[PDB]
Write a protein that binds this ligand. Structure first.
Ligand code: HEM
Ligand SMILES: CC[C@H](C)C(=O)O[C@H]1CCC=C2C=C[C@H](C)[C@H](CC[C@@H](O)C[C@@H](O)CC(=O)O)[C@H]21
Length: 403
């Protein structure tokens, strides 16, 4: 019998790092803001496929971020690590979400982020220096794209960069984990590490956010010890994994559009605009749109019922032709305003301006010091991560003009 169904499987995997998976360009094109899909466990779910609708549902208080709910749309087995663990505030709803988030925000304001610019410039050129000096060829992942945000986020959290090999490895295993067993074991490695850091900080008040949370909120019983572990773990992995994939994918992508890059290299006033457009275009975290309805919601004559799962896929909504003229075209000159790569509403990405700062420093730095950077394999040979985790390559060999 024909095989066509009205709720395709979800998610799909990318095949060119900067293009929607075929199955996603479909859903984008169907009229209507909501489409049915089938998740890995045969349950059926709603995906939002339009910009204004995504924007409205992300602001709607009837869509919960509670991941311990049995109807939360888990997209992979690995997910049931985070489901059964104490929740960071990304899995909380108002009013709990606010009191937890408000403990971390002092370190992420525009004032604090702006003033970090000297220190971020120092880290980047530091790791380039070392990269360049060991000569081509280089894997831009392990030698640059990953170490740079790791170092920055550690100094912010107060995690010692000495232990960098341990937690980078445990973060890798946890984002890319394909089964539940591997994800839990990565989580328990990281949690056990962080629990010892907290005791160490109870003996000697540490620096960073984690030190301040130990010495203050934990000492007064306003946060559970195990909640602290989850919060620090969220910031640590998010601090690392996202900026690094942006760096690698923005590099693959900028090279396959060499006439916009040229113009980037020639007018550094455009860099903050190309950052926005890169964020819109690449949307590395389309999974981070998971919600469950706690009530019936009406959207343009379609009905989400209490208990249904809804995935706001910000990569599709960012390719909404009625907001971005020719949406599948990378245009560093376009106005990429109102994009959803960071989300919207109360869960809007806490670290977005740190992420903008890192990318804008990193790019300038790559254009000053390796203006002849190019890839050391053809793009068709890179292994892409699957659609069940954050978008990116795991390896990126590159080369340049040696001194
Ligand atoms: C670099 C590229 C990044 C992308 C594409 C990205 C994407 C996102 C998205 C889409 C959300 C929404 C989650 C939801 O609505 O359920 C989110 C939340 C969050 N992100 Fe980012 N993010 C990035 C960088 C960062 C960085 C550098 C940090 C460092 C701390 C960070 C920390 C967080 C936190 C704490 C939240 C949750 C805020 C809340 O739930 O109130 N992110 N991110
Ligand atoms: C199953 C793969 C992972 C967990 C995933 O797809 O999401 C992670 C992977 C790395 C990038 C991410 C970016 C956006 C969000 C912060 C997202 C939410 C997941 C979060 O729940 C991870 C837990 O480790 C945090 C905790 O439970 O303390 C997070």
């Amino acid at each position: 019998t024909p095989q066509t169904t009205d709720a395709p499987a979800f998610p799909s995997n990318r095949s060119c790092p900067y293009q929607l998976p075929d199955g996603y360009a479909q859903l984008r094109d169907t009229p209507g803001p909501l489409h049915r899909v089938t998740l890995y466990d045969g349950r059926q779910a709603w995906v939002v496929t339009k910009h204004e609708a995504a924007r409205k549902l992300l602001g709607d208080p009837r869509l919960s971020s509670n991941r311990t709910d049995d109807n939360f749309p888990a997209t992979s087995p690995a997910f049931e690590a985070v489901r059964e663990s104490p929740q960071a505030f990304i899995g909380l709803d108002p009013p709990e979400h606010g009191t937890r988030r408000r403990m971390t925000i002092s370190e992420f304001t525009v004032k604090r982020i702006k003033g970090m610019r000297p220190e971020v410039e120092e880290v980047v050129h530091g790791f380039l220096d070392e990269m360049l000096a060991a000569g081509p060829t280089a894997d831009l992942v392990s030698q640059f794209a990953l170490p740079v945000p790791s170092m920055v986020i550690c100094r912010l959290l107060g995690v010692p960069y000495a232990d960098h090999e341990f937690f980078q490895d445990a973060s890798k295993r946890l984002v890319q984990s394909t089964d539940a067993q591997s994800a839990l074991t990565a989580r328990n490695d990281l949690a056990g590490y962080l629990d010892g850091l907290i005791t160490q900080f109870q003996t000697e008040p540490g620096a960073g956010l984690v030190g301040a949370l130990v010495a203050d909120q934990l000492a007064n019983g306003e946060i559970d010890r195990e909640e602290l572990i989850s919060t620090a773990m969220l910031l640590l992995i998010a601090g690392h994994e996202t900026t690094a994939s942006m760096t690698s994918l923005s590099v693959i992508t900028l090279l396959d559009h060499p006439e916009q890059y040229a113009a980037l290299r020639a007018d550094r006033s455009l860099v903050p605009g190309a950052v926005e457009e890169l964020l819109r275009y690449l949307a590395i975290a389309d999974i981070a749109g998971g919600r469950v309805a706690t009530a019936d919601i009406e959207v343009e004559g379609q009905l989400i019922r209490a208990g249904e799962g809804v995935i706001v896929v910000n990569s599709i909504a960012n390719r909404d032709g009625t907001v971005y003229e020719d949406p599948d075209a990378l245009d560093i000159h376009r106005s990429a305003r109102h994009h959803l790569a960071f989300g919207f509403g109360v869960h809007q990405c806490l670290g977005q301006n740190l992420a903008r700062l890192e990318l804008e420093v990193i790019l300038n730095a790559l254009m000053d010091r390796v203006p002849t950077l190019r890839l050391a394999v053809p793009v068709e040979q890179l292994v892409l991560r699957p659609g069940t985790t954050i978008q990116g390559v795991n390896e990126l060999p590159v080369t340049w003009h040696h001194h």
